[PDB]
């Protein structure tokens, strides 16, 4: 009873601490990708708008020339 109980408490403690630390670490890292992903969306939409307006204006100018 004593030996098995000591084994159980030791293993439970170590496993629980490992899982807790790993969970907190994943929690902290997720936010970095979140913010970067906001940034990449910003850049993507800016690119889309710029290229769309550029091409439409250029087609209009080409039609004016021709």
């Amino acid at each position: 009873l004593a030996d098995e109980s000591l084994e159980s408490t030791r293993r439970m403690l170590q496993l629980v601490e490992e899982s807790k630390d790993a969970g907190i670490r994943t929690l902290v890292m997720l936010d970095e990708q979140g913010e970067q992903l906001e940034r990449i969306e910003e850049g993507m939409d800016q690119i889309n708008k710029d290229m769309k307006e550029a091409e439409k204006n250029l087609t209009d100018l080409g039609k004016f020339a021709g």
Binding site: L13, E17, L27, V28, L30, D31, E32, E35, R39
Partner: protein
């Protein structure tokens, strides 16, 4: 093996062709004024030659070719391609000899900040700090680089990026017997971590660290700081860290060295400590 030898042979061939290209291009510009297309062709030859140099596993010469292409291109009144060549040369120089890599990355950061973009400059700054830390011992330059990158990141509202840089700077400052900066950074980040729905759970850890270094002064100041933190974070006492700090304080007040050692060992057994914590605790025990 054989592929590398053939690549290097044709790479020397193309380097001879490229020196011929530049010489005859300046000659033809002088004698005929053909424009700048030949210079662009020479730049492309340099770029592909550097690429096949990298393929040949000769990073020094590849970086030299990349730097030559970058300087020739910036001489051509164009920057972005020159900046790309400079950063490529820096990446090539990362291994082998990284000294000139630092200078070329400085030039890249300078041009980027002149343009007005910050995040890439911060990335280069942190990379340079990492290079200095891993290959050199002058931690002052690393501190400066980390602080500058952190400042850029906070100015650009990238608080998450700034937090890691601040934590690294605070840890390094505490390492070199300097506690004011460590205390300030740790307490500031802990306070700003109070309301985070996610980080709140870890918000305790930083606080504890501060207390430890704040004990490097003396019994008393430490009690006031820890109790102030406990009021500010009422749940802080739930964790075993406050119990351990109280045990350390009470044992050190009465000079109960054996009990202090046994408590530290018990904490190590339930949860092992890292090099920094062990060194700090041993330093505290000295007095």
């Amino acid at each position: 093996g054989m592929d590398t030898s053939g690549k290097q042979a044709e790479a020397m061939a193309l380097l001879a062709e490229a020196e011929r290209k530049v010489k005859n291009s300046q000659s033809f510009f002088s004698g005929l004024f053909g424009g700048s297309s030949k210079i662009e062709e020479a730049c492309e030859i340099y770029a592909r030659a550097a690429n096949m140099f990298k393929m040949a596993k000769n990073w020094s010469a590849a970086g030299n070719a990349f730097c030559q292409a970058a300087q020739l291109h910036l001489q051509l009144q164009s920057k972005h391609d020159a900046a790309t060549c400079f950063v490529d040369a820096g990446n090539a120089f990362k291994k082998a000899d990284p000294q000139e890599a630092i200078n070329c990355l400085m030039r890249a950061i300078e041009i980027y900040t002149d343009m007005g973009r910050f995040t890439i400059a911060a990335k280069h700054h942190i990379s340079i700090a990492e290079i200095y830390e891993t290959e050199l011992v002058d931690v002052e330059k690393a501190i400066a680089h980390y602080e500058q990158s952190a400042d850029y990141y906070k100015g650009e509202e990238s608080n998450s990026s700034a937090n890691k840089c601040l934590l690294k700077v605070a840890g390094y400052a505490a390492q070199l017997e300097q506690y004011q900066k460590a205390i300030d950074i740790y307490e500031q980040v802990g306070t700003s971590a109070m309301d985070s729905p996610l980080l709140k759970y870890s918000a305790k850890d930083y606080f504890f660290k501060a207390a430890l270094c704040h004990f490097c002064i003396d019994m008393l100041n430490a009690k006031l700081a820890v109790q102030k933190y406990e009021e500010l974070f009422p749940a802080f006492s739930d964790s075993r860290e406050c119990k351990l700090m109280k045990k350390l304080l009470e044992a050190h007040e009465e000079q109960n060295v054996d009990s202090y050692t046994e408590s530290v060992k018990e904490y190590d057994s339930i949860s092992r400590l890292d090099q920094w914590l062990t060194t700090m605790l041993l330093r505290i025990k000295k007095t």
